[PDB]
Write a protein that binds this ligand. Structure first.
Ligand SMILES: NC(=O)C1=CN([C@@H]2O[C@H](COP(=O)(O)OP(=O)(O)OC[C@H]3O[C@@H](n4cnc5c(N)ncnc54)[C@H](OP(=O)(O)O)[C@@H]3O)[C@@H](O)[C@H]2O)C=CC1
Ligand code: SF4
Ligand code: SF4
Ligand SMILES: [Zn+2]
Lengths: 48, 208, 114, 288, 95, 176, 95, 111, 126, 373
């Protein structure tokens, strides 16, 4: 979470590779953030 | 009785009541009912022969202009030998009031093609022809708007059910989209809600 | 009992209108069956048109007969236009059987269809 | 029997008809038209595809929801095929290829496929095992393809003999093969019948039991010369074993049940000829 | 507490498990029959029974305008426990 | 109360008429439009890094159609059929039976995700808030049949999270 | 913002609107989330001792639409007095 | 004036004398009507009232604001269409007694 | 103006577009609906309801619904008198079965004969 | 692709003959479905028959039912409803302007104002919880009121939006060939404006000083201060200018609404119409009973045939209701200003070429889902 950019580039995420065996170094999906980070990253709060 | 109750006034009520009585006096030939709503919108129940004299009288006559044509549909009501209702709504441009001409008719006997007096009547007329089936006397064009070209049956009626009798699907056998009879997966569960105990006793019709 | 009719004074004007309309339907066949790029013989479609005319033969009141004349007139307008495509012209045809005859026994096997 | 198999109401668009059909192949011509007739009847189709899922995906919506199921198979293993015919009511086999591959001959697909699928059909205890073949596919010479199909006929009669070996003539349709070879560019007796007569006969025989054990052969209603067919296809229209089969012969065999035993009306040539001959000079010779 | 059908696949807490002849078995070929792993029958067997010495006691389910509303159940019987129609968790008495 | 425009004359003085002639013949204000477009060209745009950034939303967003259950408790629904009574497509189908334990239950809870117009009426009608409009919007289903949720489907849907749902309810139980 | 002043001079020179102050994209201008939990008063009812529903019964006040007949007179009135011809308001008029 | 507000409306020079001779034709066509029709009375009443407004007003804008129907040629078109309805109501006899009754159970609305 | 008119039945049945299968096959039933006897409300009277006969509603083999091939199984028409029902059914053609309207019976009740002297009417508890 | 319609044009070459719009291809049977449902289920149809005006038709249907039902809405709900009427009018005008501009050309201002509309979509999210079809409005008061911490952000949006609309007047608006494109198309006589039944924006751009707001304030529109623009030529350029000044007066009404907000109340003082809040709904018997039977049966409605019409951004949005004494509407009907504007298409596009016919279809705002009735 950066405080330099504007509203919409506050929070972003970097996933990892093969969290369920996908070779997902490339072509990452959605539905991978656990839902406390869904509360965080979708800006439904101001709390980590 | 004071707070949060919709305020009405006697001023517009008395004005529209005297005006409707005045119109009923100056045209004794086709007026049947002049009902004034409590929320001050006039309704006038009318015989279907002098419809064009009524419209030429209500476009003009310098005591109330009413240059604005609006809603008209012959609202589908069964149980009556004269089923359909042609309600021409007229809105003024100088006096800011709304009057409705509810003339009655049945299915077969035609009304007399109001396009001759109002320019905005034609697509409304063609709509009512394709949807209800109300025929017109010396009318320019009766085509089908808002329906399929192969479809029939005047589907707004209470004769017509929720579904149709057609169901389009493609086949590669005869290489086109054909219409088959209906194959419903869901019931359309008609939730009956007509509960008893007569919430509005003032609108009770007198029984036998 | 005083009811206004549509057009006619007896059934004679109604017969006049409907046979002139059928003459227009008969002369209206070959141009449209060549234009629409169809695959059904002229005899079959013409016999189906005259069979559809013969379907409503049990009507005697001239108001209804003139109303069907107006119906077929609108139909012949929309077919002399190229508004209607191959879909509705084939939809007059009934190639999606539904094979159930008026046997009692074929109605016995496929039940609940009296 | 168990419920949810008995018929209910009309047919088509997720109607409950009587049958559950497992079709082998079905990506090409006749299997696709038969899937379309089963969706018209409103049954449930079990199709295993070995090809790319794009093909079964663009022939997917031919039925309604629940009317189809797709699975995956190879032409070598009995386990996937038994998994396909776990709960199956009836089963049809359609197979045939114009040229051999590096992994398949005409033999051992027409041999190794109906042996295995007829084996697991007889093991699964199903009815109306319907296997297709070709007209006058002799045990004897003039065609490797037809003698391999005759070996397939012999093996289908061999294992589970209560079956329907069904042979049409050289059928034509919207996506015909040999007439496409004729269009896009000797003596021969021939009578082609159109595809909808054949597949109506198939759906009649698969909704009419007592048909188990009988073999079928279909007849074209004209019986004329191949050269007049060429005359007509160019009049309007303005592999080596394939061309040898269509120049061999196509005769009638009236000793096995054909058309009117099933009670179906045959369709003529000229109607469907004017249909498919897109993109009136009718010869109509018809010698006997 | 999932069981196993004689066919092999998992049962449901609603008793709809398959026969030896059902073809929805053969439409479940290749993919997961998504069954639940949480059975609310035995979670109530996990729940202890409270002991409240009063006569007529309340139930809300943990929250003001959260969960089910105020239901007042009775405890006048000696041996038949007070079961909330909304909660389903029983109670006792200390007189 | 009317303020009408374009009723002003062009001035017949030589000054304004040749200024409009210079505008006409010399392409001035079109170049001023070019300058406006360049002034917005030298910005930094309002885009998002889509697999990495997800845009703003509301605590009241109506998505997943997921279920809840009680704190260490049973299944939250009652089969009181209010959601089926108010669902504007009749997309709810609840076939209900009680189990022998006394607590009232169901057999088959059915939501047509094809037919859901995504109101919130089934949320606002449920007395215990069993069916909850969900927080996330990722369905993207390849097949047609998988868009027909069942009861144990929604139970396993609720078994993946509630803390998101409980946070949205805890922020949104006071305005309604 | 967050850039050099020379392109800021370019943006102010190509369109003199002071883009640094007004830039349409917000950074910390957001009135931040997670408000204090709201407390809502009911409107002008639930006020005890007075509010019968018989007092506030607007639903039963709906009269049927009143009926007029046909089923030296100072007259010929209009349905309304004539509406005043309007005016150019002073809020930047024309011309 | 010069270039009034309404779009399809080009002003004339003397609404006074043209409107007066229009109202003389109005009174004559109204003179073609029997007295017992009170339609004649109401039209003659409102026409004489507006005519008496006209007969003593020299100014234009003062006439447009004192006499209602703003601004000017709406009164002209009003008079023209009044003549049109006059010509049409030589026909159709609107002051006649009743045409035959409806079945009289129709208009009971809650049904 | 008192024109051509001939007096017969009406022929809207060819106009309404429903095929003769559902004309002659399905049959209408016209009755006053029942008082819902758990409640006590005769407000659901005074309405001659026109209905049809229900037909097959089989189970959806994937979802378990009321899969029915019946377009006309979900209609009900509200009428005022029985004459309107008869005229409507003969207007639109298909067959009708009209049941007779069965009103309640005005029954005499009296508190004194409820609590009399030598009769057998004695509630013995209230 | 030439909204989707079919057009049959008879023409002499680049100077036409006749034109026939085949419309109704986007037909959905909403009248029949409302005839088979309840009012509370009919309300999303009145949300989406016009879909760009997502809250104005909400306001029209809600005030139709409340005008029938003798219920004064509470004042803060009236202020919120007027606020979102102005917001929805702003959105509808700006999308009609941008779709006409993209239909002729004009790439980038379309996307400038759609960035503005994305901020509007975030505002609709944060208020209701939907994205486009925010129900949010019950007949009987505005339901589920706005949360805290939004109005100062609306104030910042108002300043920056006034700046961006001034910059749209900078970029376009005395552009040379855009003016030269639109002068002589869209001519409407005032007699033809009346007789052809055009409504709102066409009546603005040609002739009559008219507004349904100014003639009949059905709400606090009387108390707020503004002035409507009028066209005089009509000359589609001038109609565009009238649209822009209507947007700017809507921004002024937004400013006056931010200045004049009372903190009163959410819904009406009637739990027989409005389903009441949660503590009394739970924790109370009478509100549970009214909640239950209100969602099952539907609120009872006195019989009658009524009508109303509001000034939607397309024009005279009319709705005609017919209701037996029930909780079901008997028959509804929708008077569409888009259909009304389309009803004179021959007399509009009589004397031009086909690209100008496309520009005339663009310059009258359309959805063809409301035009379909
Ligand atoms: N006149 C005619 O056209 C005649 C046709 N037939 C039969 O009609 C059917 C359709 O013929 P046609 O369309 O020309 O040919 P196709 O190859 O297209 O049809 C045969 C079907 O079986 C599949 N198949 C065939 N061989 C193999 C194999 N070795 N491995 C896996 N799948 C195989 C095909 O491909 P895929 O595996 O991708 O599904 C296809 O689904 C065939 O069964 C053929 O025998 C018989 C006699 C005459
Ligand atoms: S409203 Fe809630 S408790 Fe009632 S049936 Fe629906 S999900 Fe169950
Ligand atoms: S949100 Fe969906 S499931 Fe819920 S009531 Fe609306 S359409 Fe039905
Ligand atoms: Zn409890």
């Amino acid at each position: 979470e950066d405080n330099k950019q504007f509203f919409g580039r506050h929070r972003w995420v970097i996933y990892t590779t093969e969290m369920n065996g996908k070779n997902t170094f490339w072509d990452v999906d959605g539905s991978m953030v656990p839902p406390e980070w869904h509360r965080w990253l979708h800006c439904m709060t101001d709390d980590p | 009785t004071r707070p949060t109750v919709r305020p009405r006034n006697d001023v517009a009520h008395k004005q529209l009541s005297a005006f409707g009585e005045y119109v009923a006096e100056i045209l004794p030939k086709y007026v049947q009912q002049v009902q004034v709503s409590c929320f001050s919108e006039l309704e006038i129940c009318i015989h279907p022969d002098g419809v064009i004299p009524v419209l030429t009288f209500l476009r003009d006559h310098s005591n109330a202009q009413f240059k604005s044509l609006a809603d008209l549909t012959a609202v589908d009501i069964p149980t009556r030998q004269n089923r359909f209702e042609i309600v021409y709504n007229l809105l003024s441009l100088r006096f800011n009031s709304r009057i409705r001409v509810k003339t009655y008719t049945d299915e077969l006997t035609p009304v007399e093609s109001s396009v001759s007096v109002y320019k905005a009547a034609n697509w409304y007329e063609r709509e009512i022809w394709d949807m209800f089936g109300v025929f017109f006397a010396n009318h320019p064009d009766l085509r089908r708007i808002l329906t399929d070209y192969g479809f029939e049956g005047h589907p707004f009626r209470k004769d017509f059910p929720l579904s149709g009798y057609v169901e389009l699907r493609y086949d590669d056998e005869v290489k086109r989209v054909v219409a088959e009879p209906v194959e419903l997966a869901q019931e359309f569960r008609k939730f009956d809600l007509n509960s008893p105990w007569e919430a509005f006793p003032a609108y009770r019709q007198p029984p036998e | 009992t005083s009811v206004k009719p549509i057009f006619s004074r007896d059934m004679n004007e109604a017969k006049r209108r409907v046979r002139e309309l059928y003459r227009a339907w008969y002369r209206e066949v070959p141009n449209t069956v060549h234009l629409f790029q169809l695959d059904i013989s002229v005899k079959q479609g013409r016999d189906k048109v005259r069979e559809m005319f013969k379907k409503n033969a049990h009507v005697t009141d001239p108001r209804v007969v003139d109303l069907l004349v107006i119906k077929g007139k609108m139909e012949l307008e929309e077919t002399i236009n190229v508004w209607k495509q191959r879909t509705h012209v084939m939809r007059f045809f009934h190639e999606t059987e539904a094979p159930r005859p008026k046997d009692f026994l074929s109605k016995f096997y496929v039940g609940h269809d009296p | 029997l168990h419920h949810a198999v008995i018929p209910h109401g009309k047919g088509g668009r997720s109607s409950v008809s009587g049958i559950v059909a497992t079709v082998f192949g079905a990506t090409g011509f006749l299997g696709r038209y038969l899937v379309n007739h089963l969706g018209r009847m409103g049954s449930q189709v079990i199709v295993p595809y070995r090809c790319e899922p794009y093909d079964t995906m663009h022939l997917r919506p031919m039925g309604d929801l629940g009317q189809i199921i797709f699975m995956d198979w190879n032409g070598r293993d009995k386990d996937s095929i038994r998994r396909a015919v776990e709960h199956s009511n009836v089963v049809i086999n359609l197979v045939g290829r114009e040229w051999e591959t590096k992994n398949f001959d005409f033999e051992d697909v027409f041999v190794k496929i109906p042996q295995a699928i007829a084996q697991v059909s007889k093991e699964a205890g199903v009815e109306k095992f319907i296997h297709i073949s070709h007209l006058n596919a002799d045990i004897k010479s003039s065609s490797k393809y037809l003698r391999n199909k005759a070996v397939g006929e012999k093996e289908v009669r061999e294992t589970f003999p209560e079956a329907t070996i069904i042979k049409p003539a050289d059928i034509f349709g919207r996506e015909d093969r040999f007439l496409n070879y004729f269009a896009n560019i000797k003596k021969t007796v021939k009578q082609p019948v159109y595809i909808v007569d054949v597949t109506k006969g198939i759906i009649n025989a698969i909704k009419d039991p007592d048909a188990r054990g009988k073999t079928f052969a279909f007849v074209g209603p004209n019986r004329y010369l191949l050269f007049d067919l060429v005359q007509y296809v160019f009049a309007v229209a303005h592999t080596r074993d394939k061309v040898e089969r269509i120049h061999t012969t196509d005769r009638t065999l009236p000793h096995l049940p054909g058309l009117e035993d099933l009670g179906v009306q045959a369709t003529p040539l000229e109607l469907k000829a004017i249909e498919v001959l897109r993109r009136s000079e009718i010869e109509d010779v018809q010698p006997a | 507490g999932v069981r196993t059908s004689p066919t092999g696949e998992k049962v449901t807490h609603t008793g709809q498990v398959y026969d030896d002849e059902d073809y929805r078995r053969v439409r479940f070929v290749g993919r997961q029959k998504e069954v639940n792993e949480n059975f609310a029958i035995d979670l109530i067997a996990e729940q202890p029974v409270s002991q409240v010495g009063s006569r007529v006691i309340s139930c809300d389910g943990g929250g003001g305008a959260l969960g089910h509303p105020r239901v007042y159940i009775n405890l006048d019987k000696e041996t038949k426990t007070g079961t909330c129609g909304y909660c389903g968790l029983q109670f006792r008495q200390q007189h | 109360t009317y303020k009408y425009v374009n009723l002003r004359e062009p001035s017949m003085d030589m000054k304004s008429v040749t200024d409009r002639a210079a505008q006409t013949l010399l392409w001035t204000e079109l170049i001023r439009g070019l300058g406006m477009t360049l002034s917005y060209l030298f910005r930094e745009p309002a885009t998002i890094n889509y697999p990495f950034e997800k845009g703003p939303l509301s605590p009241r967003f109506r998505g997943e159609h997921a279920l809840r259950r009680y704190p260490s408790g049973e299944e939250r629904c009652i089969a009181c059929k209010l959601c089926e009574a108010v669902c504007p497509a009749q997309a709810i189908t609840i076939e209900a039976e009680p189990r022998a334990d006394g607590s009232r239950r169901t057999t088959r809870y059915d939501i047509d995700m094809t037919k859901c117009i995504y109101c919130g009426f089934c949320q606002e009608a449920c007395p215990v808030d069993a069916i909850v409009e969900g927080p996330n919007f990722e369905f993207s289903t390849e097949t047609h049949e998988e868009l027909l949720y069942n009861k144990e489907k929604l139970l396993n849907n609720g078994d993946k999270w509630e803390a998101e749902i409980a946070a949205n309810i805890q922020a949104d139980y006071l305005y309604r | 913002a967050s850039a050099t002043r020379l392109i800021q001079g370019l943006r102010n020179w190509a369109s003199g609107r002071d883009l640094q102050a007004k830039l349409q994209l917000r950074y910390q201008e957001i009135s931040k989330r997670t408000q204090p939990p709201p407390k809502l008063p009911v409107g002008p009812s639930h006020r005890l001792s007075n509010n019968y529903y018989c007092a506030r019964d607007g639903r039963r006040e709906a009269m049927p639409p009143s009926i007029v007949m046909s089923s030296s007179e100072k007259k010929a009135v209009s349905p309304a007095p004539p509406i005043k011809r309007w005016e150019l308001s002073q809020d930047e008029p024309y011309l | 004036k010069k270039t009034t507000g309404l779009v399809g409306l080009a002003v004339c020079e003397t609404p006074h004398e043209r409107l007066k001779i229009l109202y003389t034709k109005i009174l004559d066509v109204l003179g073609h009507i029997p007295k017992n029709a009170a339609y004649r009375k109401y039209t003659e009443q409102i026409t004489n009232e507006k005519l008496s407004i006209v007969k003593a007003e020299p100014d234009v804008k003062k006439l447009e604001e004192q006499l209602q129907g703003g601004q000017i040629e709406e009164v002209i078109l009003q008079a023209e269409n009044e003549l049109s309805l006059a010509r049409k109501m030589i026909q159709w006899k609107p002051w006649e007694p009743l045409v035959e009754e409806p079945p009289a159970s129709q208009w009971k609305w809650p049904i | 103006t008192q024109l051509i008119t001939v007096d017969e039945k009406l022929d809207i049945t060819t106009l309404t577009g429903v095929p003769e299968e559902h004309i002659k096959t399905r049959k209408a039933r016209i009755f006053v609906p029942a008082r819902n006897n758990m409640q006590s409300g005769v407000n659901n009277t005074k309405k001659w309801k026109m209905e049809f006969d229900t037909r097959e509603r089989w189970e959806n083999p994937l979802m378990g619904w009321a899969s029915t091939a019946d377009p006309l199984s979900n209609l009900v028409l509200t009428f005022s008198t029985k004459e309107d029902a008869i005229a409507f059914a003969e207007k639109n053609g298909w067959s009708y079965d009209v049941e007779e309207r069965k009103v309640p019976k005005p029954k005499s009740k009296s508190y004194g004969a409820n609590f009399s002297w030598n009769k057998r009417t004695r509630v013995s508890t209230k | 692709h030439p909204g989707v319609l079919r057009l049959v044009m008879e023409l002499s070459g680049e100077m036409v003959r006749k034109c026939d719009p085949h419309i109704g291809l986007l037909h959905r049977g909403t009248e029949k479905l409302i005839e088979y449902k309840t009012y509370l289920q009919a309300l999303p149809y009145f949300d989406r028959l016009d879909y760009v005006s997502m809250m104005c038709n909400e306001q029209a249907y809600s005030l139709a039912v409340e005008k029938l039902l003798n219920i004064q809405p509470p004042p803060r709900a009236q202020w919120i409803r007027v606020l979102f009427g102005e917001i929805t009018r702003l959105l509808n005008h700006i999308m009609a302007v941008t779709t006409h501009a993209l239909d002729i050309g004009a790439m980038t201002p379309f996307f400038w104002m759609f960035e503005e509309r994305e901020k509007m979509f975030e505002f609709y999210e944060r208020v209701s919880g939907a994205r486009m079809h925010a129900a949010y409005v019950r007949p009987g008061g505005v339901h589920q009121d706005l949360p805290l911490g939004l109005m100062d952000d609306i104030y910042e949006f108002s300043k920056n939006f006034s700046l961006r609309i001034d910059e749209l007047e900078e970029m376009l608006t005395n552009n040379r060939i855009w003016r030269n494109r639109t002068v002589d198309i869209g001519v409407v006589t005032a007699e033809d404006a009346l007789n052809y039944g055009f409504s709102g924006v066409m009546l603005r751009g040609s002739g009559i000083q008219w507004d349904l707001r100014k003639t009949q304030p059905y709400d606090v529109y009387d108390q707020v201060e503004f002035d409507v623009p009028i066209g005089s030529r009509g000359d589609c350029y001038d109609r565009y200018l009238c649209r822009v000044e209507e947007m700017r007066q809507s921004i002024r009404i937004i400013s006056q609404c931010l200045n004049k907000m009372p903190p009163g109340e959410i819904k009406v003082d009637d739990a027989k119409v409005s389903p009441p809040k949660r503590a009394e709904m739970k924790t109370s018997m009478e509100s549970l009973i009214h909640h239950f039977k209100l969602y099952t049966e539907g609120y009872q409605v006195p019989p009658g045939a009524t009508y109303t019409a509001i000034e939607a951004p397309k024009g005279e949005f009319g709705v005609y209701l017919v209701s037996d004494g029930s909780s079901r509407p008997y028959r509804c009907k929708i008077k569409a200003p888009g259909f009304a504007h389309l009803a004179g298409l021959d007399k509009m596009s009589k004397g031009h070429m086909l690209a100008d016919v496309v520009a005339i279809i663009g310059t009258q705002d359309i959805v063809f889902g409301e035009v379909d009735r």
